[model samples]
Target: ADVQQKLAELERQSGGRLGVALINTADNSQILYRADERFAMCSTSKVMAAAAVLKKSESEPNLLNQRVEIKKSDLVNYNPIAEKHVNGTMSLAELSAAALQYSDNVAMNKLIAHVGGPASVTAFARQLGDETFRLDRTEPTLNTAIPGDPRDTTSPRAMAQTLRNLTLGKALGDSQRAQLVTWMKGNTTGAASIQAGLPASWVVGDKTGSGGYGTTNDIAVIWPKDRAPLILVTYFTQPQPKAESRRDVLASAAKIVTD
Candidate 1:
């Protein structure tokens, strides 16, 4: 197959760990790439957190636009210290935006708390139609906290399914889904890896996750109008020598799919 040959050539050229899964969001069909490997999600877990908030809001109906206070005390150990400034107030929508747009840990923690903590988020993930996808409270490790157990994980297949649910409007209501997609469009991380290979004018909505060292991950929705939207999930860990080197591998893989 053309896909297999291209993947082999890309693997040889990149010399780094590579795993990709591309799916047609319209009908849940495979387009190309492998789908079985598991990898740490990093901040991409925030996508689940955002979906949970939207689901809860839909059920409660009155939680949207509700104000949540971010106290100075809650800022401990979160990345991008700017988010921790004292006495900041934000609505649920704002929190979700911060979490998705900047991958703000503090914002994600606040949203996670609002959604009833990690256990609730995982439960919501299952409710969102991904029974096999679970959250590994390994925040202590993949995040700023002490390295918990290396037990945190998710398969590319499950991630692709999650994206499919989002695109199909099965994960949240229309307004919520639209808002989440808007935030994702503004994602500031991992742009080079997932968006690098696409043609100019192509639109990509994505989230990237990284835990330093050689750990890198990305889940994306690529829109090329003539074709059904593509859901691409790639994750790599303990990669070759450098982070940039690993990122290059991911970029090359994306090129193969889009080309």
Candidate 2:
């Protein structure tokens, strides 16, 4: 209870709404604070895209190995990794890696198209029994981050569970699950949020997203040495008179529960 109490104080002090969900996978204990509140998924939706790709790979064994050529026209803004590979070929697995490891927008668009569309990720989440996770748009457009807008949004509770299913559940085979964890661990973002809250001895594989209206989020699977794994999702949105550098809000919330 005190964890929730401190989270509330941090939310008020940061001038942003905080939705946090922490699950101890060993015992299934949860610490949820405003965890059902909706927040824009931002680039964090890339994880859903990656998970869907892996799930689809189960039926199409060669899907991940299939190569696709990236076109100049396919590049989207903030795609640091995809833009460099214009007209170059990358396997579906490479694209998925770029999407998850670097939040590459063009790679994300290609993956979404490969799977069907934005609704594919939504359906994947639904298959896992998550009704709140939805991806209604592609990147750039999906990062609109309007307060209370449900499009391209997911709750912390929903996302944490989704991560649990993908990382530790039967949603993927052994090799596929390991691949997903590899990509998550290679993620270049999330340093300032969840990882910053923990000690160096702990290990974290996380995805981070930033969008309009001061929305910054991080979803992570954390390993505390020999103990059980923890799934943590933090979605923070500033929708008031002003927006501040409240990325620290996530680190603070993580610090609270972890402490």
List of clashing residue pairs for candidate 1 = none
What TM-score against the true fold does each predicted structure earn? 0.86, 0.97
TM-score of 2: 0.97
**Residue 51 CA displacement from its true place in model 2, Å:** 0.6
Tens-place lDDT digits, model 2, residues 116-218: 9998879888988999998999877998888979999999999999899899787899889999999998888778989999888999999998888888899
Question: Which portions of model 1 show Cα errors greater than 4 Å?
Answer: 12-15, 26-28, 31-34, 76-84, 138-140, 143-150, 239-245
* Stretches > 4 Å off in candidate 2: 240-245
How much is the lDDT of residue 138 in candidate 2?
89
C-alpha lDDT (0 to 100) for residue 3 of candidate 2:
87
lDDT of 1 by residue, 229-255 (tens): 888887665543344426666777778
